[PDB]
Assembly symmetry: C5
C-alpha cells in the first residue's frame, strides 16, 4: 500500500503543478513588442511522397520541431516532487502560428497534438505533417535533380514579436525513408529576413530547400 | 516590465471581449464597410473534363468597429493584438460559383488595431467554374468568379475595394500557368425586385500554359 | 443611433432566443409549410463508370413561425435579422438518392423577418445516382433526384413549391453540359400501411455535352 | 391550441429528457434488443484493382426503452416525436470489414413512439472488402460484409432481423450493377475464451454488370 | 458496513452511479510519469492490404489495433454496484495512450466506434479498426518472394520510463485476414524494440510491424 500511495502522490503533484500553472496564474496571451518570443524551428524530412508535374505540386512528409520558452511555464521541481517535465494537449497552451507560405492544400497532421513542457519553461511541440506545396519537379529525372522550396513562418507576427530561428541550416535526414521514390541530394533550412517599405520591423521565415531526384 | 506588458494585454482583451456587448453584425441603420482584395499565388489546376479551375490566393478583408477601439495610454502603449477569427464576428464573404467547399491554408487569426480596425487574411484554395479553352494558346483562357456577402445587401455590408488590380507580386514563378492579367472589379447592382444595392467583387483571371 | 441599433438587435435576439420557448419542430396538430426551390448553377461532372452525376445548385427553403414574429416598433424599426442556421430549427430536407454527403458551399446563415418567415438558401454540391447515357447525343441524358423530409410526413411538413420550373438564370454559360430542361415537381405518395401522404420534390434535369 | 400542442410536446420532452435518468446503455442484467434491416439502394463502384466495392443503403435500426414510454392521453394525444440521434443513446452497429469510414447521407434524426420504440434509419455509403471477379459474367460476383455491435455481446445487445431478405424495392434501376440476390442472415458465434454468444448480420450480395 | 443497499436498485441505476463515481467525482488520471509509469499492451490483427502504390511507394492496410492498460483510478468493487463487472465509455471520456504510426503518410482513418471497455480491476480495452497509408516500396510484390515492409508504432511523447509498451505475442493475428484480398500474406510479425539514443539515458520503445506479402495468383 506504500507503493500505491507514492503513485497516487506523484499524480497529485503533477495535478498540483498543472493547476498552479494553468488555473491559478494568468496564462500566456501571446507575444508582444515589449515581450517578444524566440521560436526555434527544425525539420526532419521523412519522405518525398509524390511529385506531380501536371499541377506542379510536391507532397512531403516531415516532423516539424517547434521550441519556445516562457517564464510563465517555469517552476522549481523541488516545490513539485522533483517533476522536471510534463505533457499537455497543444490546444490547452498557446502555440505559435507557424505556417507554410505556399501550401496548396491544408496540412495534414499525422501525430497526436501533445506538447512537452520542461521546468525551465521550455515547450517542445513536434507535429508530424504531410504537406502539398508549390513545386516544379522539372529535372527530377536527371542526375542534377529538381529543386523546390517552401517558406515557413508566423502568419500574423513580425520578427519584433516572434523571432524565428534554426539551430542548424542542415535538415535532419537521419530518418529519411531509404526506399522512397525520391532520393535527397540536399535539404537546407535557412532563416531569412525581409523588410517591406511600409514598415521598419523585420519579417522572418525559415526557407526549406530540398534538392531531389528519382531514385535509381 | 514583461510581466506588466502581458498583464496589460490580458486586461485589454477582457475589457473588450468580456466587459462589453460585442458586435452582433451589421444592420440597415448601422452598415459596415468591408474592404476586400486578392493576392493571387497560384493557378494550381485547370480541368477541361469538368471545367473547374483551382486557385490559391490570400483574401484580405478589413473592417472597423467602435467596440474594438482603445487608447494605447490606458494599456501600456499596446497598439494592436491578435485574436482567433472564431472569437469575433467576421463577414460572410463567399465565392458565388465555387464547385467545392473552400480549403483554408492559414491559421484563422485576425489582427485588431487600437483604431478599431480588424484585418483578416485567409489563404485559401478554391475550385470554381471555369472553361479553360484557349489555355494552350497565346491569348490564354479567361475565367471569372464573384465574391460577396451571402446574406447582407449593400445597405448592410458596404463592400469596397482599394484597387481593381489583383496583387500578382506573390504569384508562383514556376506555376504551370502564367497570368496575363488579373482584375478585381466592384459591381454594384440593382435588380428589378428590390431597391437595395447588391455588391460583389468580380475576380477575372486571364491565363495560359507556361 | 448606431449604439441603439446594435442594442435593439441584441435585445430582439435575447427575447426570441432566450425568453420564450424555441420551436420543437412540427407536429400533426401544428404542421409547417416549407417551400422549396432550386437554382441550378452547374452540372460539374457526369461519370458513366459509376453512374453518378455532380450538380451545384442553390436550394431555397422558406418557412414561417409565430414564435419568430415581432413588432418592429418595439425594437427600433428592425424588420429583419440574421442567425446561424445552427441556432434555429431547420427542416430535414434531404436528397433521397445521393451517393456522397452533400458539400455546403455557402455560409450557413438564415434570414429572419418580423412576420416570422425564415429564408435559408444553402449552396450545395451533390453527387447523386444517374445514368448519363445519351449525354453525347442531341437528345441528351435525363436524370432525376427526389428531395423531401427524412422523418416528417406531409401531415407534419407540408412541402410546397412556388413553380415547377428550376431557375436557370444563374446557370453557368460555359459548363461542360448544356441544360435542355430542368423541372421541380411536387409529388404525393401514399403507402398502403399508412393514411398520411408523403411529399417530395422531384428534380429532373435533361442535359447534353456542350457544342 | 397550437401553442398547447407545442407546449404539450415541450412538456413531454422535458419529462423524458430532463426530469428522469437517461438511458446509459445495456447491461447483462437488462439487455437490449436491436433489430437491424437493410434496404440496398445502389452498388456505385466495384474496384478490381483494390478489391473494394461501394454500396449505398438505408440501415434500419429499432429498439425499445421503458424510459421512453408515455401515455398519449397525458400529453395532448402526442403519439410520437423526433430527436437528434446525438441526444439519445444509439447502438454501436458497425461493418466489420469496411475499408473507409462510413459516410452518412441522411439527417441524424430518430423517431420515438409512445410505446418507447426508437426508429433510426441512417442512409450510408460504405466501402468494404469484396473481390468483384465474375462481375462481368452472367453468374456474377458475390461478396459479404458482417454488421454487429463493436463492444457488446449477445448478452448485452440481442441483435435480430425481421427478415433474411434485403429490401431491394428502392434499388436504383439504372445502376451499373444489377442485383441477382441480397440476403441478411443472423449469425451466432462463440469464442473459446468466453461463454457469451456474439451476434452479427451477414449481408451477402450477388450482383453483376448490367446489360 | 454491509454492501446490500445497491442490490435493491435497477442495473441501469447502479451503472449510472458507477460512472458518476469514477468520472464526475474522482479527479481523473493526468497520464503517466516516471514516478507512475503505465504498461500498455499493443497487438495487431491484420484484416487486409487494400492497395500497394508503386508510383508513390505507399501501402494501405486495414487492421484492428488492440490496446490494453490498467488504472487504479478505474477500479471498483462490483459488490457496491449490483455486481456490475464492466462497462463501456466513449474513448474521448477517458485518457488513452498516444500510440502513433511513425511512418504514416496520411492521417489514420478510424473504421469503428470509439468506445472502450472498462473492467472492475481497472483494465481498459480499446480496439480501434483503422485504415493506414504508410511508407512502403512494393517492388517484388509480383514475384514468389514478395515484398517486405515495416512500420513502427509507439508513443509520440513518452519514453519507456513513462509508457512501457508490451506485446502478448510477436505474431500478428492473421485469423481475420481477408481471404480474397489482392495480396496474400507470407508473414506478419510485431516485435517490441527498445532503442537507446546517444543523447539520453531513457530507453524508447516501439512495436515494429513487418509484413511480407505478394499478389495472390
Ligand atoms: C495577417 C496578415 C498577413 C498575412 C500574410 C503574410 N503573413 C506572414 C507575414 C506577416 C508577411 C510578411 C507574409 C505574408 C505571407 C507570405 C507572403 C508571401 O510569401 O508573399 C505574403 C504575406 C504578406 O502579408 C501582407 C501584409 C503584411 C506585410 C508586412 C507588414 C504587414 C502590416 C501589418 C502586418 O499585418 C499582417 C500581420 C503582421 C503585421 C500586423 O505586422 C497581416 O504585416 O502587412 C498581405 C498579403 C496579402 C501579402 O501581400 C503580403 O503582405
Ligand atoms: C440568403 C439569401 C440569398 C443567397 C443567394 C445570394 N446571395 C447574395 C446576394 C444577396 C444575391 C444578390 C446573390 C445570391 C448569390 C449569387 C447569385 C447569382 O450569382 O446568381 C444569386 C443569389 C440570389 O439570391 C436570391 C434572392 C435574393 C435576391 C436579392 C433580393 C433578396 C431579397 C431579400 C434578400 O434575401 C437574401 C439575402 C439578402 C436579402 C435579405 O436582402 C436571401 O435578398 O433575395 C436567391 C437565389 C436562389 C438566387 O436566385 C438569387 O436570388
Ligand atoms: C426515418 C424514417 C424513414 C427514412 C427513409 C425515408 N424517409 C422519407 C419518407 C418518410 C419516406 C416515405 C421515404 C424514405 C426515403 C426515400 C425512400 C425511397 O426513395 O425509396 C424510402 C424511404 C422509406 O422510409 C421507410 C419507412 C417509412 C415509409 C412511410 C411510412 C413510414 C412509417 C412511419 C414513418 O417512419 C419514417 C419517418 C416518417 C414516419 C414516422 O411517418 C422513418 O414513415 O415508414 C424506411 C426505408 C428503409 C424505406 O424502405 C422506405 O420506407
Ligand atoms: C472492443 C472489443 C472487440 C472489437 C472487435 C470485435 N468486435 C465485435 C465482437 C465483440 C467480436 C466477437 C468481433 C470483433 C469484430 C469482428 C472480428 C472478425 O470478424 O474477425 C473480430 C473482433 C474480435 O474481437 C476480439 C476480442 C473479443 C472476442 C470475443 C470476446 C471478447 C472478450 C471481451 C469482449 O471484448 C471485446 C468487446 C466485447 C467483450 C467485452 O465481450 C473488445 O469480447 O473479445 C478482438 C479482435 C482483435 C479480434 O481478434 C476478435 O477478438
Ligand atoms: C515530441 C517529441 C518527439 C516526437 C518524435 C518521436 N517520438 C517518439 C519517441 C519519443 C522518439 C524516440 C521517436 C520519434 C518518432 C519516430 C522517429 C524515427 O522513427 O526516427 C523519430 C522521433 C524522434 O524524436 C526526436 C526527439 C526525441 C529523441 C529522444 C529524446 C527526446 C528528448 C526528450 C524527448 O522529447 C520527445 C518526447 C519524449 C522526450 C520528452 O523524452 C519530443 O525525447 O527527443 C525528434 C524528431 C524530430 C526525431 O529527430 C527524433 O528525435
Ligand atoms: Ca437571378
Ligand atoms: Ca451489493
Ligand atoms: Cl436575381
Amino acid at each position: 500500500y506504500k507503493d500505491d500511495d507514492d503513485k497516487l502522490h506523484s499524480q497529485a503533484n503533477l495535478m498540483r503543478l498543472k493547476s498552479d500553472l494553468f488555473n491559478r496564474s494568468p496564462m500566456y496571451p501571446g507575444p508582444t513588442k515589449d515581450d517578444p518570443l524566440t521560436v526555434t524551428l527544425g525539420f526532419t524530412l521523412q519522405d518525398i511522397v509524390k511529385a506531380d508535374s501536371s499541377t506542379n505540386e510536391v507532397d512531403l512528409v516531415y516532423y516539424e520541431q517547434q521550441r519556445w520558452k516562457l517564464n510563465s511555464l517555469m517552476w522549481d521541481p523541488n516545490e513539485y516532487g522533483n517533476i522536471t517535465d510534463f505533457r499537455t494537449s497543444a490546444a490547452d497552451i498557446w502555440t505559435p502560428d507557424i505556417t507554410a507560405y505556399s501550401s496548396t492544400r491544408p496540412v495534414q497532421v499525422l501525430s497526436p497534438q501533445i506538447a512537452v513542457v520542461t521546468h525551465d519553461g521550455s515547450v517542445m511541440f513536434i507535429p508530424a505533417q504531410r504537406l502539398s506545396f508549390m513545386c516544379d519537379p522539372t529535372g527530377v529525372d536527371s542526375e542534377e535533380g529538381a529543386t523546390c522550396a517552401v517558406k515557413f513562418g508566423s502568419w500574423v507576427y513580425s520578427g519584433f514579436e516572434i523571432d524565428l530561428k534554426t539551430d542548424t541550416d542542415q535538415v535532419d535526414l537521419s530518418s529519411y525513408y531509404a526506399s522512397s521514390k525520391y532520393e535527397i541530394l540536399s535539404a537546407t533550412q535557412t532563416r531569412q529576413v525581409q523588410h517591406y517599405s511600409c514598415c521598419p520591423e523585420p519579417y522572418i521565415d525559415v526557407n526549406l530547400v530540398v534538392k531531389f531526384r528519382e531514385r535509381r
